[model samples]
Target: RRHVLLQAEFYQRSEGPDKAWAQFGFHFDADELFHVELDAAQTVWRLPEFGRFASFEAQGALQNMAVGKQNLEVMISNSNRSQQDFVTPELALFPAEAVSLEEPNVLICYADKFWPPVATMEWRRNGAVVSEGVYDSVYYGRPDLLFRKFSYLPFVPQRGDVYSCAVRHWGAEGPVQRMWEPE
Candidate 1:
């Protein structure tokens, strides 16, 4: 059985005409679960239900005007802060299974523990870049607030074959690369 989880975010506008406006967004997987707008009138608009008990709790919290205002203020203040520092990623390469020269195999490039969350990844064969049969997963957010990503290369391992995974991120002075060799 597959289990699902809910994610939530509170955001405030720090610029433009919408400055000071705040929003609360919730998601399950890639789909939006719900969204609520917070305004100066201490109004909560378009609230969603997560059963009777959760809905009642949300409604009770929204009834407090001071709490709403304070929460909005905090979100706006946090949004207006300076640029955050960058974090370098750790790279690793692995085989999807025991590699065999006679059978197709997948090379996995895993990049993890990077902050600011964006990265570029590529696969190279014997020092030349290979784009065919290369695929990657979306960057995943970690519990520690960092990010992780994976790239895959599908090919039949051959004698003297050398595979490399190159990753580029804002935190690194240059691309971080890892290689795998058929044994």
Candidate 2:
């Protein structure tokens, strides 16, 4: 039998003297399953396909799931805090197979030696954002306290097409970008 998991996060912030925002996201596996945002006026918005559910029901579910996930994350952090240190990652990009302008291939962007375990990555094809067929993994911690993450994109290389991997992290002064072309 296959297993399925659900996860959520909730955040509350004060925007100004008379404004506040409540935001949350739900995920199944690696994909965003749903999202919600509430304003100071109690007005609520949800991702399409989720708005049909009653607000109370959605909020209740989000609260329950988010609390458990948050607690576990806090516990892990507390246990590992003394063993971890901050370090900016070194990023690299690779292709799974020999490059061919007409063949489908998997492109991987690897970020390693990072600390605090937070990073974001995106892919572009010929200067335009490429969202489809992309997969990003959660950060994995090493015994030495360094962290690693990977983002993959599958596409058929086209003549003269350029692929780029962009990474963002708190440790970097600016976004790190790398480009590749078929050889």
Per-model root-mean-square deviation over C-alphas: 10.4, 8.4
Which segments of candidate 2 are over 4 A away from where they belong? Answer: 1-85
Model 2 residue 122 CA deviation in Å: 1.0
Give the local distance difference test score of model 2: 0.66
TM-score for all models, in order of appearance: 0.60, 0.54
Candidate achieving the largest TM-score: 1
Q: Which candidate is the best by lDDT?
A: 1
Which residue pairs in candidate 1 have backbone atoms (N, alpha carbon, C) closer than 3 angstroms, thus clashing?
none
Tens digits of per-residue lDDT for model 2, 101-164: 7888999999888865667898999999998989876555455756677899998988888999
Q: Candidate 1 local accuracy as lDDT?
A: 0.67
RMSD (Cα, Å) of candidate 2? Answer: 8.4
Residue 70 of model 1, lDDT score: 77
- Give the poorly placed runs of model 1, Cα more than 4 Å off: 1-79
